[PDB]
Amino acid sequence: MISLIAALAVDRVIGMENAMPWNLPADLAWFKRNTLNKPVIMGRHTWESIGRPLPGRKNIILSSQPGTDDRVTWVKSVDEAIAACGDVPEIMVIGGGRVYEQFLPKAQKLYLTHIDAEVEGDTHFPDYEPDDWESVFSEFHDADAQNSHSYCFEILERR
Numbered sequence: 001m002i003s004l005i006a007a008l009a010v011d012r013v014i015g016m017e018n019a020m021p022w023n024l025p026a027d028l029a030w031f032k033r034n035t036l037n038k039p040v041i042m043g044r045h046t047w048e049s050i051g052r053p054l055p056g057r058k059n060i061i062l063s064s065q066p067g068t069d070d071r072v073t074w075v076k077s078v079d080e081a082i083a084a085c086g087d088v089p090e091i092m093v094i095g096g097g098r099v100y101e102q103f104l105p106k107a108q109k110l111y112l113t114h115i116d117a118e119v120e121g122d123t124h125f126p127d128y129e130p131d132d133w134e135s136v137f138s139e140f141h142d143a144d145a146q147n148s149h150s151y152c153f154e155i156l157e158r159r
């Protein structure tokens with residue numbers, strides 16, 4: 001099973017200038033809980049944005065060019081990325097925009113954080129047809145001293 005996980009600001013913005021400009025520790029904690037002990041697939045730009053391997057997860061990087069770091073696994077196509085995960089229950093696709101576009105048709109589950117923040121950005125999460133997806137979990141949180149925007153954790157499953 002393939003799942004996508006992402007945090008979306010207003011208008012589905014996910015990034016600007018290869019970075020995420022906000023800081024929401026509660027959302028990063030949610031990201032870690034939902035990805036630990038699972039393979040994670042990311043595109044090369046997201047790998048450069050994170051800047052290091054994510055511990056406790058098999059890190060698989062999509063790139064058309066040869067890899068440049070043997071602490072992670074490099075693959076050259078979507079099918080190779082999936083195969084390199086092996087026989088696991090859940091593969092997590094962690095972006096970015098181009099990678100989400102390619103894996104959305106193959107995904108059964110979306111873990112989405114909706115952040116109440118207006119962000120100029122240059123990367124968006126794909127338009128997803130709402131009729132295809134059922135919301136199975138949602139949890140709203142107001143802003144607090146650690147998290148400067150309100151946010152909503154949602155899990156959607158393909159109908």
Ligand SMILES: NC(=O)c1ccc[n+]([C@@H]2O[C@H](COP(=O)([O-])OP(=O)(O)OC[C@H]3O[C@@H](n4cnc5c(N)ncnc54)[C@H](OP(=O)(O)O)[C@@H]3O)[C@@H](O)[C@H]2O)c1
Binds near residue numbers: 013045047063098
């Ligand atoms: N808010 C969030 O949840 C979230 C999550 C992830 C990322 N982001 C943000 O998203 C942005 C990066 O997204 P992006 O769309 O620019 O880039 P991306 O999807 O991270 O990476 C694109 C790169 O991945 C490689 N790639 C993708 N598909 C491939 C395929 N089928 N075969 C081979 N290689 C493939 C290519 O690398 P080569 O050029 O080397 O061939 C391509 O240039 C950053 O701003 C980041 O901060 C946000």
Ligand SMILES: Nc1nc(=O)c2nc(CNc3ccc(C(=O)N[C@@H](CCC(=O)O)C(=O)O)cc3)cnc2[nH]1
Binds near residue numbers: 005031
């Ligand atoms: N909901 C969500 N939030 C994100 O920030 C996010 N980020 C990415 C890609 N970028 C990043 C950037 C940093 C870290 C990171 O530092 N993660 C640590 C944080 C642990 C914690 O804060 O509790 C990790 O071990 O996962 C992860 C992904 C993909 N999907 C996401 N999905």
Ligand SMILES: [Mn+2]
Binds near residue numbers: 077079
């Ligand atoms: Mn092929």
Ligand SMILES: [Mn+2]
Binds near residue numbers: 086087
């Ligand atoms: Mn198999």
Ligand SMILES: [Mn+2]
Binds near residue numbers: 009114
């Ligand atoms: Mn949203």
Ligand SMILES: [Mn+2]
Binds near residue numbers: 116117118148149150
């Ligand atoms: Mn806000």
